[PDB]
Amino acid sequence: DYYHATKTTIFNALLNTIDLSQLAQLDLKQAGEEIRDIVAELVAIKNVSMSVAEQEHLVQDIINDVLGYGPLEPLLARDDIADIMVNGAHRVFIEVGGKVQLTNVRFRDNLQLMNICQRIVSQVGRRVDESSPICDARLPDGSRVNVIAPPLALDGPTLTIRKFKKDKLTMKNLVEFASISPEGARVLGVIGACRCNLVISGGTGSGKTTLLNTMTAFIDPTERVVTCEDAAELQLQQPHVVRLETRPPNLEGSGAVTMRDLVKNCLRMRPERIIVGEVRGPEAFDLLQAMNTGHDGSMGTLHANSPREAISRIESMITMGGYGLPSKTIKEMIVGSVDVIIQAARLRDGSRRITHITEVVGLEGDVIVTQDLFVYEITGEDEHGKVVGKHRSTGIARPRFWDRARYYGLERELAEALDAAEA
Amino acid sequence: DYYHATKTTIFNALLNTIDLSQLAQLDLKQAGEEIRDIVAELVAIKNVSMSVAEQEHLVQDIINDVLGYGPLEPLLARDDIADIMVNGAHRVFIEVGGKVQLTNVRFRDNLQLMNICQRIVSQVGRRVDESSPICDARLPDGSRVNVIAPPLALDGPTLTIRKFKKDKLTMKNLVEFASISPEGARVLGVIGACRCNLVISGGTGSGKTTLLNTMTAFIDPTERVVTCEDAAELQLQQPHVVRLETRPPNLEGSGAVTMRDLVKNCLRMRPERIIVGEVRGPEAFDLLQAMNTGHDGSMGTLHANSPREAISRIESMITMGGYGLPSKTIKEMIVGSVDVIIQAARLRDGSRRITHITEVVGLEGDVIVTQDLFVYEITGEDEHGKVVGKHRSTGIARPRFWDRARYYGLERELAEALDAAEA
Amino acid sequence: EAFDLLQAMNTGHDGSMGTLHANSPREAISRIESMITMGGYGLPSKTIKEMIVGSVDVIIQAARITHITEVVGLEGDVIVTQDLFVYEITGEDEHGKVVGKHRSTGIARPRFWDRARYYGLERELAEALDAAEA
Ligand SMILES: Nc1ncnc2c1ncn2[C@@H]1O[C@H](COP(=O)(O)OP(=O)(O)NP(=O)(O)O)[C@@H](O)[C@H]1O
Ligand SMILES: Nc1ncnc2c1ncn2[C@@H]1O[C@H](COP(=O)(O)OP(=O)(O)O)[C@@H](O)[C@H]1O
Ligand SMILES: [Mg+2]
């Protein structure tokens, strides 16, 4: 009570001596000294029990409450926190290490929630109020912010904050987690710099984005890479990258910049390879054009269960655009475009596996045929109950892209990895 | 070294005295004289250790700041810099000798780069802002400019200035670069004077404009040709040719003269054959009508990848007009108005090709019939990786345009081309 | 708008529940297809049905809770749909009540066996659904 009552009583002196309406006059620079003196004046005039160190702590608390973000100032500094969800004034949760835990932190009222939300979302020109209910933005620090207003939220306005993860699983980690055999890792390392146009496929939450990020690390630093994402998840260690992001309609169908527009624009920036975040709409067609007109090295991630279904989904996405194409021409384009297809699924035990590393043999008649280089076969469950299985080659000595490895000087490594497959 | 602080002080002094807010006064020559005098006075007063040459260079920097393109001023005016890329505001790259490389040049802040881009795109009366972040322009001097704004780009505004080298290629050069061989290309020379409709189709950077320039130099001087372009690109050497160019909306969003406004007028200038630079939207319709009603021998470069896709694109472009004709009627208009639909596309390696010399025959309802006088197939890759393919005369001694081209007596060379290379 | 919900039910947000007004499971799926097509997205009906299969696992068809049914897959326009609980009518009572019974169809492994095993509830399924047959 005292640790809160002292502040509740002291804040009145600071508010009355210089009202918040005086903002921009004696700003942060002068405001720091103003608060440092006003807190001391209030402590001297009004008896206080907190110590001198406690006096400085309360001065800093006043600074945070007046200028800073107040309640959320400590949380935003902790690196072990990923999400900060509010949903109210006294009921605030956080996420540390996957799980979600409630916290003992309290606002003052709903009006303070609105104040903090507006003062934090204004940093990127957004404005949310009773007339504008919803707000969604990407702050400069590298975080996502979302806010919902009263008229819709019966319980009251809600706030949601995220973070940009900086510890992503490297290829060595995936090797440790036994999701891809070391021979598979060697073959993937060959493919990465081999400039093959891979297309990652897998079910929801099967490890697609992480696998794509791991693959991107094999790019030589002397190439322009332009990434078209919707959530800004990837991070590359190359010295030359042009990160792009779409924009949803901020009003009733105005200002939309669909991923198709970004992919189409990238064709003119002279990229060396286009990397897409998630191919959902008709943009697939444009991406295939990029995969065809001398940008060997592109990558993508769709949502399919098996590579055959990945091909079917690509055809469906192309047809969705309504270009009036004949199906056989689409199949020819896909056959000439996609060189590799990596399948990433998750099993009933919660683990993640790379079921297939497939290549496209071509088109025979009216059917698309494929060859395989690694297949994850299940055999049973161990005593505990975890899934049990292992990979294997299909006796294919020189892949359909061996000449590429010869061209780029990776013939020896690929030959050793594939010959070592017989182990 | 220390020139940065001294230059900042000099710029501040000049702005305080000769402020940029006095625009419309102290014009170019007056601005230069005033800046020189002010910089000399400041060097006399402001403590600067720079020498006389250093003072002159500081004056030049002041001039660039006041009325220049910013630190890019020396970048654009060098000898053999093919491409100039700006990824953000600190990592400007340049391409030399067919390979990229970093440059120590760097800007002052993202805002200055944004202003510089918004000014460079001003030469063509176009605007880039937060409500329209993508800009693609052809500078009058001939270079190509692309700009993306912070709302989409994450690392700051992204800029790409790709200059174009000297004078285009003749048909002889196109035969030298294996683009097409005479035995299957003689139809190009035949149509160079056969005066039949033609529509070049291709993808970005596929060389459509150069193909048109090569295929229009055959037209004999006696004919009156009216060329319509978004910006000066073609350099025909015939004696009787009329050139035009559109005007985008002015400062107040008025005075726009779109391609339709020019083609509809050219319909009443007694032209013998129109040459449209690039077809984008409704103008297509008018051009087709021009080809249908007397003005036989037109040309127009659209944007597509496959001839069927090109025809569907034309259909959609006309549908944008809002007349209410069926697909079959518009396809018949194409058949009787479009004779040859060439295709130009880059292969998986990049080198230019001519994948089609196609002709339109007729209709069988809502489905078009399209003979393919020529096609282009790909065998695989070469020892060094570059693609290997073959054009082949599909074989038609008497094509659809046999009758349409019988007047000039050109069925002779038509039979020669389509029989001397039938196998 | 169901589309968004159906997108939620597939794109990682497991455990979404919707409420519509349709008589039979075929009628429910037909209504879902019509609603999806109503949005102007123009998705071919085949892909809409595939999305419906992906997003729908359990149908509590009240019509009483007359039906509890689940999807099995697709083979074309046909939407393979089996049953878990069926309510049948046998006659009428002197007071006029509709006399019937509610049968656990009999199949032991519904489509959601894997989820139940993951969360540690297959034993409950055996204790309830397998014992219901006997
Ligand atoms: N092989 C793996 N072993 C362990 N954890 C993994 C593995 N692959 C991915 N993860 C975890 O999965 C998360 C990475 O995001 P991911 O699961 O790939 O999202 P996503 O596939 O982009 N989802 P969506 O695009 O919405 O379907 C992290 O928590 C990783 O630790
Ligand atoms: N056969 C060819 N060989 C090499 N370069 C070519 C060939 N044909 C065209 N080009 C190149 O294409 C460019 C022409 O640009 P183009 O793609 O026609 O502009 P647009 O983007 O408007 O289509 C020229 O710079 C030229 O060097
Ligand atoms: Mg052009």
Numbering used by the authors:
A (entry chain A), B (entry chain F): 80 to 502
C (entry chain B): 362 to 424, 432 to 502
The authors write:
The bacterial tight adherence pilus system (TadPS) assembles surface pili essential for adhesion and colonisation in many human pathogens. Pilus dynamics are powered by the ATPase CpaF (TadA), which drives extension and retraction cycles in Caulobacter crescentus through an unknown mechanism. We show that CpaF assembles into a hexamer with C2 symmetry in different nucleotide states. Nucleotide cycling occurs through an intra-subunit clamp-like mechanism that promotes sequential conformational changes between subunits.
After incubation with the non-hydrolysable ATP analogue AMPPNP and in the presence of Mg2+, the sample was vitrified using holey grids and a data set collected for high resolution structure determination. Subsequent data processing yielded a map constituting six subunits arranged in a C2 symmetric ring. Side chain detail was sufficient to build amino acid residues 150–502 relating to the N-terminal domain 2 (NTD2) and C-terminal domain (CTD) for each subunit at 3.8 Å resolution overall. Henceforth, this CpaF structure obtained in the presence of AMPPNP is termed CpaFAMPPNP. Although CpaF was incubated with AMPPNP, this nucleotide was symmetrically bound in only two of the nucleotide-binding pockets within the hexamer. ADP coordinated to a Mg2+ ion (ADP/Mg2+) was symmetrically bound in the neighbouring subunit, with ADP alone in the remaining pair. The ADP is likely derived from AMPPNP hydrolysis given non-hydrolysable ATP analogues are not entirely resistant to hydrolysis. Comparison of the three subunits in the asymmetric unit showed that whilst the AMPPNP and ADP bound chains were relatively similar with RMSD Cα = 1.2 Å, the ADP/Mg2+ chain underwent a significant conformational change where the CTD rotated ~34˚ around Hinge 2. This induced the CTD to swing upwards 18 Å relative to the NTD2 resulting in a clamp-like effect around the nucleotide binding pocket. Importantly, these conformations showcase the key stages in the nucleotide hydrolysis cycle including ATP loading (open state), ATP hydrolysis to ADP with the exit of the γ-phosphate from the active site (closed state), and ADP bound with low affinity primed for release (open’ state).
